[PDB]
Amino acid sequence: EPVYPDQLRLFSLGQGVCGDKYRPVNREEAQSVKSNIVGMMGQWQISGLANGWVIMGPGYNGEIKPGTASNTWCYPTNPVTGEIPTLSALDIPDGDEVDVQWRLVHDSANFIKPTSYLAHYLGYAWVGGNHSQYVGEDMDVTRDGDGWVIRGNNDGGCDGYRCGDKTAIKVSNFAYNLDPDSFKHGDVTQSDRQLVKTVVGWAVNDSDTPQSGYDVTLRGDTATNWSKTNTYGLSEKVTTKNKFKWPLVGETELSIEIAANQSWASQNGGSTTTSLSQSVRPTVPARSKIPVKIELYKADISYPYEFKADVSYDLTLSGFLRWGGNAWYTHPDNRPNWNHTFVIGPYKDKASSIRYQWDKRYIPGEVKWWDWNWTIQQNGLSTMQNNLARVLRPVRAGITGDFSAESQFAGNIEIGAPVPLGLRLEIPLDAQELSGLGFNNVSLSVTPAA
Amino acid sequence: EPVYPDQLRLFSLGQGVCGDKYRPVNREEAQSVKSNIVGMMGQWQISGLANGWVIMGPGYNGEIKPGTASNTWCYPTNPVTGEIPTLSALDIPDGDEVDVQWRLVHDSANFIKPTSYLAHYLGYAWVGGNHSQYVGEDMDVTRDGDGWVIRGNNDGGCDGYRCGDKTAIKVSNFAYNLDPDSFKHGDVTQSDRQLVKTVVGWAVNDSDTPQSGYDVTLRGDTATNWSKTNTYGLSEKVTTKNKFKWPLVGETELSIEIAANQSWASQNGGSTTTSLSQSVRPTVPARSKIPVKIELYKADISYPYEFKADVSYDLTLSGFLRWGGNAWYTHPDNRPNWNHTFVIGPYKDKASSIRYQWDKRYIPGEVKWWDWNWTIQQNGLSTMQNNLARVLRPVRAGITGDFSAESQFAGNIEIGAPVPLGLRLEIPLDAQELSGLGFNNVSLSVTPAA
Ligand SMILES: O=P(O)(O)OC[C@H]1O[C@H](O)[C@@H](O)[C@@H](O)[C@@H]1O
Ligand SMILES: O=P(O)(O)OC[C@H]1O[C@H](O)[C@@H](O)[C@@H](O)[C@@H]1O
């Protein structure tokens, strides 16, 4: 009965019209998940709803009001019910890699219990230590190269058929993707925008024609010099998927690009040369000159910073599958030894994706791995939704350090009131002082706007 | 010449087909704005791109690959160009409201210049004081009953036609919206999650056939206590637009609801009954009892928290429009007194929103206030873009203080494997003892899942 916004589909077939298998979303349903729908919309997008209503984009504040639209937000006549909720992220503060993983995989409520449950619901046998009669208790977490293994304790002996063969949950292949958008910074340790030099003068119009087609344009270059630290080692293994420019704090401007596919901890500063470029379209009255000034600045900035890195890992379940109750699509009854890897994080393929397999579980052709319906048959839709929501809970780790920059730049060429006496400049540029100041190859040139 | 996510439109018109005036987005362009496109997509939606490529929705990690789809992501053959960039937030350090307003309107480079320039680009006369030849200089900032007034110093004489009639920029109707997603916190002052009692016992199936039709259900209730402080008083005037759950720090799951349209400072919390209602539908074999166990915990967390509140305000330009040079759509030529207000912040209506006007500038019927194509022609596109980008640059204020919570709760009901001898329970519950631990009206009962 809840509308799942991740199942909406937009059609462009004319007023109130959906493609085969879809039907228009109504004003009340769209109200119930309103921020999800708007967030799936373009700034000024206006899309239709049932029965003469439209929802508007974030630029209009996601307003729902009567109106007509040739494109319509639609919802399946046969939606997939019982989606797996997405829980709030679990944030792990910055530390060394081993310590960050440890806080993750040794957490009984958020990792050991959920994943052991998962094993157990799929029919994996013996998911717990010998010191508990409950699933995912008495579980030893031990290092395995760059990951970990969690497996019931095996001290002393046991009963049960093959009871010594505990199921293992191997956590490996951790990756950490830094999210630029998660940037945050503590108090500005140091800040100041300092007027270093002013370049001042005149542009004259020596002619009868009121000159006004020309750009006047500053050129030249300077440096941004920056550095950062990394408080812990996890930074050695952290990357960012796409390059981004270091974010703007306050009234400064830097040219720092962080690069993709390269250690966070191996990008600790350096000197990139920003570029001077300002232009200005002045209109100059009948044989008059105009005052012209360009302010040159240096700026320092420094603060502690925090980004968050999305942690992903592979979870491999290994053990035998029980006679007369397991969830492999072929329902083997011979207790074969099994190994399956689920990718916990960004999707890699169908076989390794609980979300895919679960969302498609009513499509017979798609069921080539686990039989999720069987697990619902066993435990109820509820229990599975909540277990899987926990298993899939997003994990982030804090990546921290101190940041520091200084850069130089030029303000906008500023233009004054025209006073009376193909445009001409009279704005002295002391190449040598500027160069001494750090402003190199500076040049002022006049050229046409068309 | 980047692709503007805003101008993307999805068409469902068969493989490869766009609506008139649009063209398919190619795989390189999809790639450059991937997260934008993916965020407009159903979980498993697959959508066409140029030349037999497709992009897949978030469930598939935004993957781009060869494929066919009957809907297509398109882009205009003639896009609207020069979108006003969106700069990162200007961050004002927490203070009283008077401190936050003071800091904002007195900021020359971030407020006085850009607003002064904007008024000058629109044709307002004399945006500047007597003691400077430049726009947005020698500007007095005075208080006008409530908000502010920025206006050229008018002391001693001035030259120029009508030069005593200085344009004024007034700041007023401030508001402050807490952005929940801007959360960060300081040192996690104190944390801990402690077992206070284990309830154990049995559930019996005395009947001859297996039993799967009963929920075993825990009831009762516990208090949750949380408190927050407010370092400053801007907090009295902050609101959130929508309710949100206090965020999850640490491992701890606590339930807290910040309500909309209610002062931040008015919600420092207190004590809130939460229920322990919990349920499980076990399957007990013929003639058997399962071991049962419920764990009871207390947890507490505390820390300095920090959220950012968006500052929004009305910006009113008052002065006369120059003869032979203004942006009002009718281009008046009689130096009329003009007052116009823009809403710097969430959209309210067309007249008072720069972004809307800017973006719709090429629709002659939508030009009923300012002529932004004329501003572009007069000053150049880069210059207006950069100017408007400074005037629309988000301003935020830090909302800080201390957070603390105590909570009690039960782990899920756990079930052991069936051992041989609706459904019967022998699980002790000492009314008193439990109450002394902060667990009230505790009960365990069995009912039909129907
Ligand atoms: O019934 P199966 O397939 O042999 O499972 C073998 C074992 O699996 C589970 O882990 C437990 O219930 C054991 O007591 C059981 O004997
Ligand atoms: O005569 P107008 O064009 O109405 O403008 C009057 C004055 O306005 C502006 O502030 C300046 O450009 C002046 O040089 C001009 O004299």
The string of DSSP codes covering A163-182 is: TT---EEEEEEEEEEEEEEE
- Asked how this structure was determined, the answer is X-ray
Cβ of B336 closer than 6 Å to ligand 2, yes or no, is: no
Number of residues written out for chain A: 450
Between CA A9 and CA B10 the distance in angstroms is: 10
Q: What is the 8-class DSSP label of residue A370? A: B
The burial of A90, by beta-carbon neighbours within 10 Å (0-12 exposed, 13-18 middle, 19 or more buried), is given as buried
The CA-based diameter of chain B, rounded to the nearest angstrom, is 107
Instruction: Kindly list the domain boundaries of chain B, sorted by start residue.
Output: 1-89, 90-175+310-396, 176-309+397-450
Cβ of B334 closer than 6 Å to ligand 2, yes or no, is: no
Fold entry, domain B176-309+397-450:
Proaerolysin; Chain A, domain 3 (2.170.15)
- Which amino acid is present at B371? D
Q: Mark A374-411 as b/e (b = at least 16 C-beta within 10 Å).
A: bbbebbbeebbbbbbebbbbebbbbbbbebbbbbbbbb
Any B CB within 8 A of A248 CB: yes
- Name the minimum distance, in Å, from the CA of A88 to any CA of chain B: 7
Interface touch A7/B43, C-beta < 8 Å: yes
Between CA B127 and CA B121 the distance in angstroms is: 10
Contact B253, B409 (CB under 8 A): yes
**DSSP codes joined into one string, A309-324:** EEEEEEEEEEEEBPTT
Displacement of CA A197 from its chain's centroid (Å)? 40
- Name the minimum distance, in Å, from the CA of A234 to any CA of chain B: 19
Find the helix or strand (DSSP H, E) in which A377 lies.
Answer: helix A372-391
Q: What residue in B sits closest to A93 (Cα-Cα)?
A: B250
Any A CB within 8 A of B386 CB: yes
Fold entry, domain A1-89:
Pertussis Toxin; Chain B, domain 1 (3.10.40)
Residues A227, A228, A233, A236, CA torsion sign: negative
Residue B402 DSSP SS3: strand
Residues B45, B51, B53, B55, CA torsion sign: negative
User: Which are the contacts of A295, defined by CB distance < 8 A and separation ≥ 6?
Assistant: A195, A198, A199, A410, A411, A414
Displacement of CA B409 from its chain's centroid (Å)? 31
Contact B8, A42 (CB under 8 A): yes
Distances (CA, A) of A319 to A131, A170, A376, B197: 19, 11, 22, 33
Interface touch A40/B40, C-beta < 8 Å: yes
Nearest to B431 by CA among B420, B443, B423: B443
Interface touch A42/B40, C-beta < 8 Å: yes
Closest CB to B380: pick one of A279, A347, A348. Answer: A279
Tokens of B325: 């040079």
Nearest to A375 by CA among A170, A113, A119, A1: A119
Between CA A350 and CA A330 the distance in angstroms is: 17
Instruction: Tell me the chain A residues in contact with residue B19 when contact means C-beta distances shorter than 8 Å.
Output: 12
Between CA A106 and CA A99 the distance in angstroms is: 10
Ordered alpha helix ranges (H), B2-85: 27-32, 34-38
Q: Are strands A22-24 and A414-415 parallel, antiparallel or unpaired?
A: unpaired
Between CA A138 and CA A129 the distance in angstroms is: 4
**DSSP codes joined into one string, B412-434:** PPEE---EE---EEE----HHHH
Termini Cα distance of chain A: 60
Interface touch A42/B378, C-beta < 8 Å: no
Cα A209 to ligand 2 centre (Å): 18
Positions of chain breaks in chain B, given as the residue before each break (C to N > 2.5 Å): 421
Any A CB within 8 A of B107 CB: yes
Between CA B248 and CA A390 the distance in angstroms is: 14
Number of the ligand closest to the Cα of B120: 2
User: Which are the contacts of B341, defined by CB distance < 8 A and separation ≥ 6?
Assistant: B314, B315, B316, B317, B352
Between CA B372 and CA A88 the distance in angstroms is: 43
Distances (CA, A) of A57 to A38, A41, A45, B368: 5, 5, 5, 22
Q: What is the 8-class DSSP label of residue A26? A: P
- Name the minimum distance, in Å, from the CA of A436 to any CA of chain B: 26
Taking domain A90-175+310-396, whether its CATH number is 3.40.1350.10 is answered by no
Tokens of A105: 């995989």
Any B CB within 8 A of A280 CB: yes
Between CA A10 and CA A12 the distance in angstroms is: 7
Cβ of B293 closer than 6 Å to ligand 2, yes or no, is: no
Distances (CA, A) of A256 to A72, A272, A437: 42, 7, 21
- Which amino acid is present at A426? E
User: Which are the contacts of B348, defined by CB distance < 8 A and separation ≥ 6?
Assistant: none
Cβ of A126 closer than 6 Å to ligand 1, yes or no, is: yes
Within 398-427 of A, beta carbons closer than 8 Å to B belong to 412, 414-417
Distances (CA, A) of A424 to A205, A215, A216, A250, A282: 6, 11, 10, 36, 12
Contact B329, B369 (CB under 8 A): yes
Distances (CA, A) of A36 to A39, A292, A374: 5, 50, 31
Termini Cα distance of chain B: 61
Residue A128 DSSP SS3: coil
**DSSP codes joined into one string, B338-376:** EEEEEEESS---GGG-HHHHHHTTT-GGG-SSB-HHHHH
User: What is the C-alpha radius of gyration for chain A, rounded to an integer number of angstroms?
Assistant: 32
Which of A122, A126, A167 has most ligand 1 atoms within 8 Å of its beta carbon, as the pocket-test mutant? A126
Displacement of CA B316 from its chain's centroid (Å)? 26
Q: Which single residue is written with the structure tokens 């800080």?
A: B400
